[PDB]
Amino acid sequence: KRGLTDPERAAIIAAAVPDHALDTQRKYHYFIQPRWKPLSEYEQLSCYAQPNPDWIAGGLDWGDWTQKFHGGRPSWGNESTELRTTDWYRHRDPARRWHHPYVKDKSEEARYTQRFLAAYSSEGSIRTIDPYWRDEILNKYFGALLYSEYGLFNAHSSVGRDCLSDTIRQTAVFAALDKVDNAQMIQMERLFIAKLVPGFDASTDVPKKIWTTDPIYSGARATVQEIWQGVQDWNEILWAGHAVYDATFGQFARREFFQRLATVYGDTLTPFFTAQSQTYFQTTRGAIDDLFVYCLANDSEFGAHNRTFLNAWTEHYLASSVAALKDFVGLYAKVEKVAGATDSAGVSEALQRVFGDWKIDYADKIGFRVDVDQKVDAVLAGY
Amino acid sequence: KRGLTDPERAAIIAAAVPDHALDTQRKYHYFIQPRWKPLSEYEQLSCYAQPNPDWIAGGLDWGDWTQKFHGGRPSWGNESTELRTTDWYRHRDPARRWHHPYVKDKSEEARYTQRFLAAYSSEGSIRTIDPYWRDEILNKYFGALLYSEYGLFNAHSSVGRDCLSDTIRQTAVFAALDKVDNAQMIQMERLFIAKLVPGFDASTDVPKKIWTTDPIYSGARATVQEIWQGVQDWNEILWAGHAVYDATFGQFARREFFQRLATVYGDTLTPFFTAQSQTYFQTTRGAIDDLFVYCLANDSEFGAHNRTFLNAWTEHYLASSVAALKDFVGLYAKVEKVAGATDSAGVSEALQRVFGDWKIDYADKIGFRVDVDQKVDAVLAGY
Amino acid sequence: AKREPIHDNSIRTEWEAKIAKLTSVDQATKFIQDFRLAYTSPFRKSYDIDVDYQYIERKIEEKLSVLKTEKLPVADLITKATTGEDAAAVEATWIAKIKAAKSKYEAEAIHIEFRQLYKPPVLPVNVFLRTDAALGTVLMEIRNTDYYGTPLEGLRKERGVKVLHLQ
Amino acid sequence: NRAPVGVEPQEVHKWLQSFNWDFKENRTKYPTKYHMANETKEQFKVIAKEYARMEAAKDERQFGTLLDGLTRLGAGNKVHPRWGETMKVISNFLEVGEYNAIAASAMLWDSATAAEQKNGYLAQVLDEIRHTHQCAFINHYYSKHYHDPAGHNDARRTRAIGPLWKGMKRVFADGFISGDAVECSVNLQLVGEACFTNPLIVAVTEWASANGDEITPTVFLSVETDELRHMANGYQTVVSIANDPASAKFLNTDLNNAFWTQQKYFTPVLGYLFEYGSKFKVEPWVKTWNRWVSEDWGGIWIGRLGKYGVESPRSLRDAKRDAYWAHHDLALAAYAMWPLGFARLALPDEEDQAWFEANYPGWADHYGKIFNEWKKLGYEDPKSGFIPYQWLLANGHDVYIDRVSQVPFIPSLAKGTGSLRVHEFNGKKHSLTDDWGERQWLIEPERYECHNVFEQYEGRELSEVIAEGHGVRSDGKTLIAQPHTRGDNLWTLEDIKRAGCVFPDPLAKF
Amino acid sequence: NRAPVGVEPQEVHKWLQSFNWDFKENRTKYPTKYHMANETKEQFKVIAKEYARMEAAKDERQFGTLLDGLTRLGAG
Ligand SMILES: [Fe+3]
Ligand SMILES: [Fe+3]
Numbered sequence A, B: 001k002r003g004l005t006d007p008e009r010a011a012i013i014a015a016a017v018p019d020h021a022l023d024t025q026r027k028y029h030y031f032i033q034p035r036w037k038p039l040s041e042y043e044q045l046s047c048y049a050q051p052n053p054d055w056i057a058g059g060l061d062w063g064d065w066t067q068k069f070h071g072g073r074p075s076w077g078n079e080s081t082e083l084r085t086t087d088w089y090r091h092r093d094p095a096r097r098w099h100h101p102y103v104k105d106k107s108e109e110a111r112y113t114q115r116f117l118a119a120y121s122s123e124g125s126i127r128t129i130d131p132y133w134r135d136e137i138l139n140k141y142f143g144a145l146l147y148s149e150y151g152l153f154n155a156h157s158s159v160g161r162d163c164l165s166d167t168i169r170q171t172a173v174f175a176a177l178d179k180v181d182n183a184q185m186i187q188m189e190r191l192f193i194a195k196l197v198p199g200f201d202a203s204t205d206v207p208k209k210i211w212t213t214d215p216i217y218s219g220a221r222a223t224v225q226e227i228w229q230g231v232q233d234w235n236e237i238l239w240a241g242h243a244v245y246d247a248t249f250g251q252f253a254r255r256e257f258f259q260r261l262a263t264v265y266g267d268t269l270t271p272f273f274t275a276q277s278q279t280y281f282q283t284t285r286g287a288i289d290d291l292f293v294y295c296l297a298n299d300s301e302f303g304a305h306n307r308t309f310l311n312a313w314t315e316h317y318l319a320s321s322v323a324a325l326k327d328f329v330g331l332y333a334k335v336e337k338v339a340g341a342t343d344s345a346g347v348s349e350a351l352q353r354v355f356g357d358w359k360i361d362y363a364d365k366i367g368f369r370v371d372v373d374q375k376v377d378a379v380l381a382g383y
Numbered sequence C: 001a002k003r004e005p006i007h008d009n010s011i012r013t014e015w016e017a018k019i020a021k022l023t024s025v026d027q028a029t030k031f032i033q034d035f036r037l038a039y040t041s042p043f044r045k046s047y048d049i050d051v052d053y054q055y056i057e058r059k060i061e062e063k064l065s066v067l068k069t070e071k072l073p074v075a076d077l078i079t080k081a082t083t084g085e086d087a088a089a090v091e092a093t094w095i096a097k098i099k100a101a102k103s104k105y106e107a108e109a110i111h112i113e114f115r116q117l118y119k120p121p122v123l124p125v126n127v128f129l130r131t132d133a134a135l136g137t138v139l140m141e142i143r144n145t146d147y148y149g150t151p152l153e154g155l156r157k158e159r160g161v162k163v164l165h166l167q
Numbered sequence D: 001n002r003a004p005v006g007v008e009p010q011e012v013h014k015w016l017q018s019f020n021w022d023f024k025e026n027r028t029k030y031p032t033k034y035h036m037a038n039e040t041k042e043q044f045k046v047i048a049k050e051y052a053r054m055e056a057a058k059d060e061r062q063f064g065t066l067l068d069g070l071t072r073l074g075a076g077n078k079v080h081p082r083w084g085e086t087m088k089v090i091s092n093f094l095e096v097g098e099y100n101a102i103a104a105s106a107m108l109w110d111s112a113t114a115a116e117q118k119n120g121y122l123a124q125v126l127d128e129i130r131h132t133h134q135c136a137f138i139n140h141y142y143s144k145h146y147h148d149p150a151g152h153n154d155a156r157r158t159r160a161i162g163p164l165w166k167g168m169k170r171v172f173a174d175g176f177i178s179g180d181a182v183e184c185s186v187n188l189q190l191v192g193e194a195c196f197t198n199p200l201i202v203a204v205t206e207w208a209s210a211n212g213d214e215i216t217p218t219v220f221l222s223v224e225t226d227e228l229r230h231m232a233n234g235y236q237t238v239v240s241i242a243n244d245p246a247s248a249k250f251l252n253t254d255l256n257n258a259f260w261t262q263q264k265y266f267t268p269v270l271g272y273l274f275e276y277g278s279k280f281k282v283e284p285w286v287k288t289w290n291r292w293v294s295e296d297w298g299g300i301w302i303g304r305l306g307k308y309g310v311e312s313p314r315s316l317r318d319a320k321r322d323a324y325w326a327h328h329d330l331a332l333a334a335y336a337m338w339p340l341g342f343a344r345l346a347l348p349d350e351e352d353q354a355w356f357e358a359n360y361p362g363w364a365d366h367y368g369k370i371f372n373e374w375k376k377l378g379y380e381d382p383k384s385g386f387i388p389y390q391w392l393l394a395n396g397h398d399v400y401i402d403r404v405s406q407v408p409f410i411p412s413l414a415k416g417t418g419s420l421r422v423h424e425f426n427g428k429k430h431s432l433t434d435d436w437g438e439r440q441w442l443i444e445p446e447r448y449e450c451h452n453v454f455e456q457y458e459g460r461e462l463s464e465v466i467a468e469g470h471g472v473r474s475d476g477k478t479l480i481a482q483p484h485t486r487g488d489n490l491w492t493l494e495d496i497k498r499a500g501c502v503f504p505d506p507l508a509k510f
Numbered sequence E: 001n002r003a004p005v006g007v008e009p010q011e012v013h014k015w016l017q018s019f020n021w022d023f024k025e026n027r028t029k030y031p032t033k034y035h036m037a038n039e040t041k042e043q044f045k046v047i048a049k050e051y052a053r054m055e056a057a058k059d060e061r062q063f064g065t066l067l068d069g070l071t072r073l074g075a076g
Helices: A007-016 A041-046 A099-123 A133-160 A167-195 A205-212 A216-229 A233-260 A270-297 A301-335 A344-366 A372-380 B009-014 B041-046 B099-123 B131-162 B166-196 B205-214 B216-229 B233-260 B270-297 B303-335 B344-367 B374-378 C011-022 C027-038 C053-071 C074-079 C087-099 C104-118 C126-145 C152-159 D008-015 D048-072 D081-111 D116-145 D153-161 D163-177 D181-210 D215-224 D227-241 D245-276 D285-308 D316-324 D326-336 D350-359 D363-376 D389-392 D436-441 D453-457 D462-468 D493-498 E009-013 E048-072
Strands: C162-166 D421-425 D426-433
Touching: A007 B009, A007 B270, A041 A167, A041 C053, A041 D116, A041 D453, A099 A270, A099 B270, A099 D116, A133 A167, A133 A205, A133 A216, A133 A233, A133 A270, A133 A301, A133 D081, A133 D116, A167 A233, A167 A270, A167 D008, A167 D048, A167 D081, A167 D116, A205 A216, A216 D389, A233 A270, A233 A301, A233 A344, A233 D421, A270 A344, A270 B099, A270 B270, A270 C074, A270 D181, A301 A344, A301 A372, A301 C053, A301 C074, A344 A372, A372 D181, B041 B166, B041 B303, B099 B270, B099 E048, B131 B166, B131 B205, B131 B216, B131 B233, B131 B270, B166 B233, B166 D493, B166 E009, B166 E048, B205 B216, B216 B233, B216 B303, B233 B270, B233 B303, B270 B303, B270 B344, B270 D163, B303 B344, B303 C126, B374 C104, C011 C053, C027 C053, C027 C104, C027 D285, C074 E048, C087 C104, C087 C126, C104 C126, C152 D181, C152 D436, C162 D493, D008 D462, D048 D116, D048 E048, D081 D153, D081 D181, D081 D227, D081 D245, D116 D215, D116 D227, D153 D163, D163 D245, D181 D215, D181 D227, D181 D245, D181 D285, D227 D285, D245 D285, D245 D316, D245 D326, D245 D436, D285 D316, D326 D363, D326 D389, D350 D363, D426 D436, D462 D493
Parallel strands: none
Antiparallel strands: C162 D421, D421 D426
């Protein structure tokens, strides 16, 4: 018997319900300070889910945790990062992603991708791709790039555990899933091509050997290993990973090299895959920007303090990223020269774009001085 | 008071409902002959919605229509097409699209497209597109191609009204909407570029002038005008429009010219749009193939009769399409030479692909003899 | 006794006033270390400010951290404890101590005291967390060996509690 | 070759194990006694795109039912009040478990060495975000459509006032993330989800519908579909450490501590919420507990793990012994301290009392007698100046808080099996209530320093504590919590103050 | 200029009237006594993608209610 439809229970229930509302405040978690005009559903469903006490900036609870680690490490604590703020709950993802819209959007991408592949194979459009680009550059080097995305994904494991608020945790996990999705989409592209071109080997053996032993990815692999396993400050991981390394090396490899060149060598397939990785990069950027610039670098009480650490980290990881790009440009020696694209002038402009965009998007925001021409020369030394 | 939740009505209703089912056949329209293993929901919801009488092959109703046109033209009649079949309801779209899955899929495409554009603009990837390709070829000639898609869309107005069964009507309308969607996506691309590149004119004035007065599209415009307004046999319109004209001229223009070349001139934007038009082409093809090959050309009683008309129409419209391609290849004179792509050898291979695929996909199926090399030379005369 | 309100009270206010007087890194380091030794962990010297010590500790941490960024060269922020020691040296010294512990009782005091003396901002976070993890691993292995071997009556004696009531 | 082809998720999954690579520093950042094997495989071959596709489809059905159908049917206010109040607690308390399970699953992802094992944990990280938003959504929906939005609309702050919340934080927040990752995993997946959450989600939908709530079944039936992956994760955690000699030495100790931990709070709290928080009853908690814990988990689930050296927990016998009266004992504390909560409570009526006495012979003579006395003294009447917590103190029936589990204990009125131990250590007094938790505190005092409500509120008058914690409705004076579920005669801060209830230090007598 | 921008349906709709072109045979195939004016405008600025988006959202709510809620309630 369901109380909603059973005539007798429904009657009993109707008798117990008062004929007036006992309060008029119907806005779920009405006390959350809205970032925009009115409270959004994203804020309502996400904010204050984390039960922080008052001794962790912004928390509404009190007292110590009920159970801590052996030795005394708190469930969540201030010792987890160098950065400080007056409120750890302040962050808002500009895209307002709670779980539902996040999977909804990715689901659209999942299903459309499969319709696109069935049609692409029926079209026979792989017929005009440059076979060298396909066999030597795409299969091997694009394949090896999946490990960088995968290392960035893995870097988020400790962040997911250690970060200090619910909005941050959501931003970090979605960022992680998008990174592993990028790695799986690269592998999906390689497996798809293997079905079309007899003899094309989609196994990861070669790409793995290239990521771990090829000088072209040596600096990238070293930096990713460091970001993932060499540190635990969760803010350092996110900043270094997305705002420095991925914003310079990753943007260069994905956009300036594999996507741009695919449209120089007649590759009509790859741009469908990088369209996704690049859309994920920009969505992730909006959130990372809110966390580091609006919330932390501009904290009214700790902004200068935080900029001190953000500037220190940037100097260190930018040097690593420049070294990684220095090694990576050695890949241009294996491709057909194309003026304005793979020649010295082409690479140089691709580098000005990457560093020039990075300066506006990140550096200028935290007060980090950077000489774009010097960074371009630093990398061109590897050309 | 809702009878489901009101205690007294629900009680009265519960008393009236028998305690056993009055029949055990719960399969909606169980008598429809299934094409596949079990009846699909697509067949259940679509089949026999059209109320045809027995004097229109396959109909289950009887008698004359209740109201006819002045003069006596029937609401639907055999006089609407030359082709004959033992059952007009036999057609099945292989993708099984009833309205819901159709809008669901297109909705995914609509929303993803806007996320892609916001990110693409944030990326600044338009910076590396060849400005000539952008300004002279894309803006003008790709822009003019929207009129061909739009004329093909319009050709379906009388088909939507005159065709003889529900599955066919669905196939035809979805095919139409996809054609106008292609025209609107071309215009959306042009408007998007105008927001990025100051001075880029997204107005349709020039593209319209090119479609109506440029020799490059003269033959295409003549053929589209004929298919749309010169005939009314609804089967002739679908066959000529999709299986001949769009399968040769359209596939060449969209895939061999604008998509292929976009990936030779550094255009990372256009391939996102042609990915859609080409996916729509292949989905439409599966349905057109079922209607003309499985149902009509292979009708047990009228197959030979139908192949006679299909062969006659193909000869006529293929000549028009070859003439249209002959004019269109004059466009190669306005682009930068690129061996294997825009040179005589490149165009020739692009043409072998188009005609060679067309022969396998359509011609061989209806018994139409075609010499691919002759058709390639016929068009190359315009190069 | 009578507690004042949870989040804003005279105890928290009085301490915030003392903290505002801190002007140097070495003074604030001594302050935070004494504070942690006097008021935190089960071996603290005093439970007098039990309900406010965590919030007050956070405020000292904020002061020290700001003094660090204003007065210390950037390189020092990454490689040194505010006591002036090299961070890597502190890590090695404390792993060595716990590795020499002969009982869970000695191991536990070493892990607890490391935290009282070196919790950030005294030691850089990356070094502190990996040291704290290494110490925890050893403490658990010692403690979890034969966990149920000693009867409650014995454990009470070993711990040194004063049994006030057993039902 | 122009045949239409795509790439299925399992095709990509086949290569996932190969995504990880070897490097010196490639090891977990968290303290642990165990080593998860690097060749561990996962049961579900899921990739990021396929995960989104699967989940989005479920969401569309769920949100369609809620926002379209049930809203058109006015279902939000067709719930029995007792249950609609209970849902303020159940949904938000479960919310913290889903939320902290995100962080826990991330920690386990960090702990695993195999790409597949990390992937299985990752899927759970995402699922737990999904459930956090689903628990929130139930309260959000109730806030819009149910006759009493207070508490459904602000539990993330109002839960901090009361003692019941402290216990929930130990089992479903701190217990999930603070300790050896394997200990956390046993708390979360092996015991928490396999023993309690999985059957609980389902049970809640039954009690909910029985009581006119169709909102909860819509959401929870959807949450249930993800839970299998999580139980599979627990299983894989065991398989992954089975060949590590450390598991022979430590696993059964970590499992026993976790089982005790989880049962200590759920045995009394779930029976209390189900039996006292509903009008229509589905079945007695004693029977449910035996089926879930002893039969299903203890027998079938733990039995399958025997091949890996997992033993039925040593403390199972003790837990079973306590699973008859413990929730009734807890109800005394919960009703006595009703103003500290954020839900409206209903004393059992004549019909409920007959049901309790029929299922728990002896209930009427102990608990029923006390509830009837409280009713007589004015439990429900704002003008009485009567709060039962005061009655308990006056009659020498002190309430203590277990320093370890945070679960309240009334030794003089308890029929369950706990027993009070009060120790002084380094100038501070601590009350423990059972052998398992006393051992935990004696061996690991630094893991258990949680301040209890008496320590925090000592010497303060009750209405001041409630006001400070925002335990009031929008008028700023009527309490969110109430001792009855009627629409009139609601208590205000002034009515509470009238009682003059001041918090003592219960250990000051020792 | 890297501001994030997209293209709204009304932006595309603004150019729709210009998609048709003049040619001798451009006239209806059906018998009629009337002539519909060629400058007629429509009230709803809908394009193919926006039509699908609008409709699919309504369907999800409808089918969710039927296949999930009402079926669980035995409403049939
Ligand atoms: Fe969950
Ligand atoms: Fe779960």
